[PDB]
């Protein structure tokens, strides 16, 4: 056997790990399958994509086209349906009819060998007809054959009877393909909509308590759900809900020693009261959790729990499974670190004494929470546990429960971030919070919406309990508004951490990304009712951004994204499309000064000619404009963070 | 099983066609194996390359290093030995000693847990020692263990006794490797020196005749060999040596009708006198060919024959194997084309009626010429015959005779050119003749000496019977000198077509790359003795260029190549290295005007500090200079095309 086939079809993409791991999509998502396709000699080729479903049924006729002249790189868009493991193949072939037409259009006018040319056409169309399944279609082609062979008609009309739009459409549907050659199949994992598309809200239930009982419970915190749903969120992310250790408990503002009342850090998991399968006694019981989950469900909210594989020194594992930790010669276990950050309140897990026991216990714990209606997990610092351990764990869980979604909370070097996604993580945290200038956002999103999108789905949190960027610190509310618009329009999954709405932006000190009086170390009650009454929350904007996402299929996908040039460094423009839905966004990244600029739209990228003028509506205001190749904008911080426009019919 | 191992080792290169085809090298050639290597957490990794020979014997210890900070991309240089199929593996591992050192260097000075730290070191070094095979090495490590454990000494000195250069060198040779993880093996094809390195001369034997017998024979043409060898060539490329058809024979200057005396085009192969396994009767017999081959061999010249799979209409195949041709409805066969070029004197071969017969006959013909001492074939227009046909043919021939070298004469689009090389062609013609400005040369050679070099070996013909570039037309002799220097110094394989020495540069017309009175259509006797006597040949320069190549291992390889900036667009500079051999070249690409410029050498790329000054000798003149970071050059066309300098000890 030869590696290369009769008609070369090479380097099909997407591909992950040379075919050893699947490429990704979700139900209803469109992406490009491509390949390098050409033949020997000078005649034309064609190609097409055969997408097969989990039962092996091929999808519809999907012809490809050359993506740029001289490159022999061909592509077509395909769309994933039901969930499961699919496959895709590229078929390449000689296209004798295109070749013959092109020659015939020169030779019949210039009078060279006309009978021989037309008879050669007739025989092609005869072979075309044999492989057409439909009777009306077959009769149409055999009619063009008899017109091609009628030697009493002028040559130009024998020809034109084979170039009619009626024949075109039969051949575009059932073309004559010579020497059909197939690539080896490549795997596609199709997962549920929520893996790619969703709005996420993070809050600490303990903070939502009462005057008589400041430490909130699942029952008091449930009161916070109707407002979260009213802001248009789909997922609630809860930091760890388990008991919290006492030995080396941290105090307020990340101090080493807790006082008597201090609540500790939820990530310091485990005490005599329980471990990763228990509920912190001050939050309530497993039943109170079921109630919280049930009430979330009625409002269209799914719960995501934090899974953090590590232990306080008081966790039961510390004595039940000493071999899950690395011990130093004196018997002690070194606290976990993430330089320059130190975690004096926890121990890391060691994996090389009993990898089987840890895997077995990890899936037991996830299955526990899954039985209680949690189908989504944020996996904390996955990059400090082995890559292959996550590969195994995710494959075990997704083998019985393929709807479960895992989110990799890894802010680390690129290779590890990409590898985690490739080995099964449905979603990834990103470098979003550190991309704030126009060049940074353009470069980064070009990467995420390009080839990386075949294996990674990004979750754009505009802030987290660990990240209050200097942009928000110095920019105030106008900066909060800009980052919300950006995050909500550039990724189909985005989120915020409670407090973001109120523009909380006081840092621990100058040059830090920690919050002052961080919620991680203390109860943080908030006056939601006052902020709403006084207009000092951006909840309305957030609510509107999520409404726009729900009304615009273009914002529920990632890969179709184009940046349009402007003449000001502080103003950025881009568009996204999905069928007949087109959304155009223009953002002023200066939160302090008003910016005016001309936005020069790449009109072909919108499906329009250069001279055209198109009606848009700014969905943030309800105002309508008429926009074409070149448009003046004026963006004043406080008043207008951005225009978020839809293209009208 | 998981795809990813305990210590991730990913995306090893070079790789060709996802591992389905081998990467390439020749005996004694060095290239870089690389990989993406990292681990979970914060401890250090190391890696190494295990290169295995055809019998499976591993090469020496070959540690890798990170190529740039923060990238997790690791590399090392390996060197291929004997010919055959080798394999290479990357091994990745935790490097506990590097990790412990780095921690210990902070914790001992700052006085934290010092006894515990030093005891942890002692135990690592104890495990190191157990695995060391040498007695003196083992005693050295166990000495450092006892110094580390001596609690009566200050902590800083217990430590310093484990960081000595004597211990360093033991551990760099036999390091402690945790959790060794291996990549899957990748294939390497190692071929003979000549596949990468050689100087090639093309001439038509028929043109080297006498007054009494103008059509040369193998016996008269042999008289031309001593001068070819004296010019330092290693390979003689002969256009087709078979009988030449009469039907539609072309006349002089590519005219359609031959007169009675016209000799025809050698590529129009075949008559009743014979086909691809015969000798043209005017060239002599098979015995005269053996004599020619033998006399070439005595001078250190190998023969490369042209293999052109096509037929004159008088070729015996036309009636013996009609199914090897595509016939039109009236039974005629269309002449071959290569738009806009037409080949009215030949028929192309069709491959889809009897691919097995064509393959079998093709290898029969190549084995015939191989029995007569031809171990190299230039395959004419391979891109008009199926890719898979060549893949099959080359694998059949190389399976019994792996020393046979094939050269792809394909000037076409990039995808086909790369594919031909990947499927087995030892050598490829290139776009060299159309890269003449400094930007064009820099861009192109950066491509060829980069990743493409794992599958393609370039042959830089400065001219061919079909290519007389406008640069040579307008530039005269000074242009011929420049292109010879460039071709000879930028690729380890280069060549010329006879007449190049004499600066033949009259085109067929303005805007054509054909020669006037082309040798393809007529006998072209040349007065070599007169040109030598009158100094009107650049034979001396050519002779000197090949001598320099034979005396400088850096010019007998392709991958080590760096371009150095100059302040003039017409002046280009570059260096090449191989062990302690460094060659530095500066060329003036203006053939009409003298150019002066400053050459600013990237000194680190030469293995030198910025302030240093290095002695060089211009091997074209014997003149010596002293050169450092910034050097004035003055290059006058006619006098000085270039400096070709060696770095002196
Ligand atoms: O109690 C352990 C530490 O918890 C936090 O650190 C978390 C961080 O908030 C989370 O996003 C990251 O992925 O994991 C670390 C460790 O679980 C506190 O900020 C630390 O001060 C605590 O020591
Ligand atoms: O006789 C056939 C044709 O031979 C030449 O064309 C060659 C050309 O020289 C070679 O380098 C190219 O790759 O292949 C063609 C065909 O063999 C003449 O230049 C043509 O005019 C002849 O028709």
GROMACS .gro file of N, CA and C and ligand atoms in nm, chain A residues 237 250 254 265-269 306 308 310 338 341-346 378-383 409 411 464-466 514 518 520-521, ligand 1:
model
  122
  237UNK      N    1  -2.156   2.929   3.998
  237UNK     CA    2  -2.034   2.865   4.042
  237UNK      C    3  -2.016   2.895   4.191
  250UNK      N    4  -0.612   3.039   5.776
  250UNK     CA    5  -0.571   3.177   5.750
  250UNK      C    6  -0.672   3.274   5.807
  254UNK      N    7  -0.552   3.741   5.408
  254UNK     CA    8  -0.445   3.643   5.386
  254UNK      C    9  -0.335   3.651   5.493
  265UNK      N   10  -1.062   2.987   5.472
  265UNK     CA   11  -1.068   2.980   5.325
  265UNK      C   12  -1.136   2.850   5.283
  266UNK      N   13  -1.240   2.858   5.202
  266UNK     CA   14  -1.311   2.738   5.161
  266UNK      C   15  -1.226   2.632   5.091
  267UNK      N   16  -1.116   2.675   5.027
  267UNK     CA   17  -1.026   2.582   4.958
  267UNK      C   18  -0.942   2.496   5.056
  268UNK      N   19  -0.944   2.530   5.184
  268UNK     CA   20  -0.870   2.449   5.282
  268UNK      C   21  -0.966   2.345   5.332
  269UNK      N   22  -0.984   2.242   5.252
  269UNK     CA   23  -1.094   2.149   5.269
  269UNK      C   24  -1.067   2.040   5.371
  306UNK      N   25  -1.692   2.361   4.285
  306UNK     CA   26  -1.551   2.363   4.277
  306UNK      C   27  -1.503   2.227   4.321
  308UNK      N   28  -1.153   2.074   4.426
  308UNK     CA   29  -1.015   2.105   4.457
  308UNK      C   30  -0.947   1.987   4.526
  310UNK      N   31  -0.695   1.855   4.716
  310UNK     CA   32  -0.597   1.899   4.816
  310UNK      C   33  -0.671   1.892   4.952
  338UNK      N   34   0.238   2.802   4.497
  338UNK     CA   35   0.222   2.836   4.354
  338UNK      C   36   0.301   2.964   4.329
  341UNK      N   37   0.301   3.268   4.537
  341UNK     CA   38   0.193   3.246   4.633
  341UNK      C   39   0.219   3.121   4.721
  342UNK      N   40   0.188   3.134   4.850
  342UNK     CA   41   0.198   3.023   4.943
  342UNK      C   42   0.060   2.987   4.999
  343UNK      N   43   0.037   2.856   5.017
  343UNK     CA   44  -0.087   2.807   5.073
  343UNK      C   45  -0.061   2.732   5.204
  344UNK      N   46  -0.021   2.806   5.307
  344UNK     CA   47   0.013   2.746   5.439
  344UNK      C   48  -0.099   2.664   5.501
  345UNK      N   49  -0.223   2.687   5.457
  345UNK     CA   50  -0.338   2.618   5.513
  345UNK      C   51  -0.373   2.486   5.447
  346UNK      N   52  -0.300   2.446   5.344
  346UNK     CA   53  -0.326   2.318   5.278
  346UNK      C   54  -0.204   2.231   5.246
  378UNK      N   55  -1.585   2.299   3.829
  378UNK     CA   56  -1.464   2.377   3.813
  378UNK      C   57  -1.352   2.307   3.885
  379UNK      N   58  -1.252   2.261   3.812
  379UNK     CA   59  -1.145   2.187   3.869
  379UNK      C   60  -1.034   2.286   3.904
  380UNK      N   61  -1.005   2.300   4.034
  380UNK     CA   62  -0.913   2.400   4.084
  380UNK      C   63  -0.767   2.356   4.064
  381UNK      N   64  -0.686   2.449   4.013
  381UNK     CA   65  -0.543   2.426   3.980
  381UNK      C   66  -0.513   2.286   3.924
  382UNK      N   67  -0.576   2.251   3.813
  382UNK     CA   68  -0.552   2.119   3.758
  382UNK      C   69  -0.406   2.094   3.719
  383UNK      N   70  -0.335   2.201   3.689
  383UNK     CA   71  -0.195   2.194   3.650
  383UNK      C   72  -0.096   2.157   3.758
  409UNK      N   73  -0.932   2.540   3.570
  409UNK     CA   74  -0.891   2.667   3.632
  409UNK      C   75  -0.741   2.678   3.640
  411UNK      N   76  -0.419   2.888   3.524
  411UNK     CA   77  -0.359   3.009   3.471
  411UNK      C   78  -0.213   2.974   3.477
  464UNK      N   79  -1.217   3.755   3.900
  464UNK     CA   80  -1.232   3.637   3.989
  464UNK      C   81  -1.190   3.679   4.130
  465UNK      N   82  -1.226   3.600   4.232
  465UNK     CA   83  -1.175   3.634   4.368
  465UNK      C   84  -1.024   3.654   4.380
  466UNK      N   85  -0.946   3.605   4.282
  466UNK     CA   86  -0.802   3.624   4.277
  466UNK      C   87  -0.750   3.727   4.178
  514UNK      N   88  -0.497   4.124   4.418
  514UNK     CA   89  -0.589   4.085   4.525
  514UNK      C   90  -0.687   4.200   4.559
  518UNK      N   91  -1.047   4.055   5.118
  518UNK     CA   92  -1.099   3.957   5.023
  518UNK      C   93  -1.201   3.862   5.087
  520UNK      N   94  -1.245   3.562   5.032
  520UNK     CA   95  -1.187   3.430   5.055
  520UNK      C   96  -1.157   3.406   5.202
  521UNK      N   97  -1.132   3.514   5.278
  521UNK     CA   98  -1.089   3.508   5.418
  521UNK      C   99  -1.192   3.566   5.517
 1299LIG     O1  100  -0.693   2.781   5.134
 1299LIG     C1  101  -0.610   2.751   5.023
 1299LIG     C2  102  -0.587   2.877   4.945
 1299LIG     O2  103  -0.713   2.916   4.883
 1299LIG     C3  104  -0.694   3.031   4.792
 1299LIG     O3  105  -0.610   3.000   4.683
 1299LIG     C4  106  -0.684   2.932   4.578
 1299LIG     C5  107  -0.738   3.036   4.469
 1299LIG     O4  108  -0.837   3.125   4.522
 1299LIG     C6  109  -0.795   2.952   4.350
 1299LIG     O5  110  -0.855   3.031   4.247
 1299LIG     C7  111  -0.676   2.871   4.294
 1299LIG     O6  112  -0.711   2.804   4.170
 1299LIG     O7  113  -0.643   2.771   4.396
 1299LIG     C8  114  -0.585   2.829   4.513
 1299LIG     C9  115  -0.556   2.709   4.605
 1299LIG     O8  116  -0.670   2.622   4.612
 1299LIG    C10  117  -0.637   3.154   4.864
 1299LIG     O9  118  -0.618   3.277   4.770
 1299LIG    C11  119  -0.509   3.115   4.933
 1299LIG    O10  120  -0.458   3.225   5.009
 1299LIG    C12  121  -0.534   2.994   5.028
 1299LIG    O11  122  -0.412   2.962   5.092
   0.00000   0.00000   0.00000
